[PDB]
């Protein structure tokens, strides 16, 4: 029988006045004897209807897959409202409800540092740059290298791992070649969480 | 004072009899006044001498950093042996204790989804593929994109959310140049965890 997804906002998105912060509801594996799904959204438990629903598609096998996706202002989510979307198809024996809300706490600051390529690594095509961050509550956070206003998209960061203060940590690696390192070009470490002074900082790194 | 990070083996490393999995115990912001910096690793709580100590680096403002490399044995990890770094350093009022090893719980298989571009997203420079998966106990999971055996690395993947029924999800965004979209090109998500059969599946995209 259907699945259900929902999924919280971009940690970007709510960081930022100018991004639109949203809630995705999904629904895969519905049948196509009974392709019909229903949508009802509740913030505090109250339904709201400014909803936007995707057409259906029939995706790849047999069954079609549903997008519903809901608009949450900034002020709200911060206010820790709920978010719930329930589901309805005839294939269920009841509908199935999701419920997503910031996490509660105190918020706490994240601390970044940036460690530059290893000895053993020097004589490879391409080496590594690392961006280490901690100390950090909630957990949602935007990680991003880039270099001379380009973004460098060749990075894969961690998901927060839970220490034992109660706060998070990661890292995030970046892989340049070689070449661009030892020009003397510099590469920063951009961080966004709720917690930072302009919910941004940066870290920069380079040779010598 | 000195701050320490410990982090857990990568997911595809302890996946893999070919690879080499390894805990690894990070310093930083220790002071020029006292640079020497002590490692003890335990093992289930017995000390073990086969820990790798890197030699430590006088980076950016300064404060020196220190990083020593413990291997794991895949069985061990398995076996749910406990792993603790301990640090000490002069200007430590007592030394810094870390502990990882892998989450208690019965393993629970990932079910992997992809989804091709929208409607409203056809008329780009650029495209976006989505890989979900959920379902999946414990959160370590390797998720990654390829086309044509080559690796695709302009992808985003979310931290894992623990959902209502204790099993984790994630979405794996691809960003591709919609040139290649159209041109009929497969593109496949691979997901690794131990639950799947072979630690292994895929998932392929292509247009129509």
Same mark, same amino acid.
């Given at each position: ?24 509801? /999904? ?18 438990? /109250?339904?709201?209807?400014? =909803?936007?629903?995707?057409? %259906? ?28 979307? *329930?589901?309805?198809?005839? &294939?269920?024996? =009841? ?7 910031? &996490? *509660?706490?105190?918020? %706490? ?9 290893? %000895? ?13 961050? *901690?100390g ?5 956070? =935007? ?17 927060? /791992?839970?220490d034992s203060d109660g706060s ?7 892989? /340049? ?32």
């Open positions: 029988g259907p699945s259900v997804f929902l999924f919280p906002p971009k940690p970007k998105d709510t960081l930022m006045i100018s991004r639109t912060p949203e809630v995705t509801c /999904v629904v895969v594996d519905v049948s196509h004897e009974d392709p019909e799904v229903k949508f009802n959204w509740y913030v505090d438990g /109250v339904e709201v209807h400014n =909803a936007k629903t995707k057409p %259906r598609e029939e995706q790849y096998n047999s069954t079609y897959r549903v997008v519903s996706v809901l608009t949450v202002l900034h002020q709200d989510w911060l206010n820790g409202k709920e978010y719930k979307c *329930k589901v309805s198809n005839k &294939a269920l024996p =009841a509908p199935i409800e999701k419920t997503i809300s910031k &996490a *509660k706490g105190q918020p %706490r600051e994240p601390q970044v540092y940036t460690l530059p390529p290893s %000895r053993e690594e020097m004589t490879k095509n391409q080496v590594s740059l690392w961006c280490l961050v *901690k950090f509550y909630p957990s949602d956070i =935007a990680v991003e290298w880039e270099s001379n206003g380009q973004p460098e998209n060749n990075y894969k960061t961690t998901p927060p /791992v839970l998070f940590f990661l890292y995030s690696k970046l892989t /340049v070649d070689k070449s661009r390192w030892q020009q003397g070009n510099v590469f920063s470490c951009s961080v966004m969480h709720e917690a930072l002074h302009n919910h941004y900082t940066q870290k920069s790194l380079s040779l010598s």
